[PDB]
């Protein structure tokens, strides 16, 4: 009815898109635990959606088996031990796995997820770093400087058009920049 609903709205209304996996280089897997479903499933869906945009090829909520912590108790405060009541608690577990991403993008995703987290859901992340066999923390000061430069590049304000800002993050950046911080090691 002459009202152009763009593609993002359409995507929201439908199921979440998933990018295909080029190589099986499991970068990170994220397990989501909760004592119920509805929130957890929603959260997983949201994670998938954000992963799509950050192009991360996320697989999807593979349900790992639910736990069951049972506990029985005599109903009465005193005696009547023949009458007993049970209690249970189901730890519902879902798995996400990111498949191909440059670390920074993955970090951003994870940071975004934890920012807009839901009520009942706990989270655990296993990150995987394919490093070479031999390593060196000898050529140090230069490597530190490079790392600082990379950080600066990452956290640069491109256009201040009322974007999201954090005071703590700004402070951290300022600390990283400082001469005292550079001095630390030597």
């Amino acid at each position: 009815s002459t009202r152009p609903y763009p593609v993002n709205v359409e995507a929201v209304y439908y199921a979440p898109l998933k990018l295909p996996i080029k190589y099986g280089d499991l970068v990170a897997d994220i397990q989501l635990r909760s004592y119920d479903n509805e929130n957890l499933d929603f959260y997983s869906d949201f994670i998938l959606r954000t992963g799509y945009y950050l192009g991360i090829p996320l697989t999807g909520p593979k349900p790992l088996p639910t736990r069951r912590e049972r506990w029985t108790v005599i109903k009465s405060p005193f005696v009547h031990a023949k009458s007993k009541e049970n209690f249970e608690r189901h730890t519902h577990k879902r798995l996400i796995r990111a498949w191909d991403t440059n670390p920074e993008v993955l970090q951003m995703l994870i940071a975004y997820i934890t920012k807009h987290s839901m009520a009942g859901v706990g989270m655990k992340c296993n990150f995987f770093q394919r490093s070479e066999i031999s390593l060196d923390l000898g050529s140090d000061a230069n490597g530190l400087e490079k790392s600082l430069s990379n950080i600066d590049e990452l956290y640069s304000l491109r256009n201040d058009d009322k974007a999201q800002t954090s005071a703590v993050g700004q402070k951290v950046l300022e600390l990283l920049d400082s001469p005292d911080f550079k001095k630390h090691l030597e």
Binding site: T72, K82, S83, K84, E85, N86
Partner: protein, 174 residues
Amino acid sequence: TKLKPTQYTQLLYMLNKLHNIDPQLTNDEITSELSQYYKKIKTLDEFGRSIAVGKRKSSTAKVFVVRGTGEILVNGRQLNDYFLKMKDRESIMYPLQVIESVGKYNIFATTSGGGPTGQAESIMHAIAKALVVFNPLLKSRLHKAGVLTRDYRHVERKKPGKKKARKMPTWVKR
């Protein structure tokens, strides 16, 4: 809420008789009045064998049944080696025995979970389902024999006060 069964039966009787009027002689008015009161297939694989999964107690049996001469392999080994009790073997055979097709079909069973007798029963169940695909006309016969029924008999849990499911601890009067 004021509708009674007897009233409904009467209504049905009235409708049915009207409907029964020979379709050629029926009217438009009658039909208008009566208008108010109206209202996946299994196949063989690439290699020509019918997969089927059966269950009993804790057991699960995925069974590949194929048209080659009748030999058995339960869980990657010989039938007499796996099932020591002859009863279990007889049970397994029974779907092929109700049909005259023991010797016709090669069977490759793969079980998991439960104990031996339950596993054998699950295999049998799977085999019947597999057979049903080869000839759908025998399905009714298999059902009659009592092989197509999934045996529901599930182990009852231990209830709190009771020792086992039903076994209660001793009662005393004095």
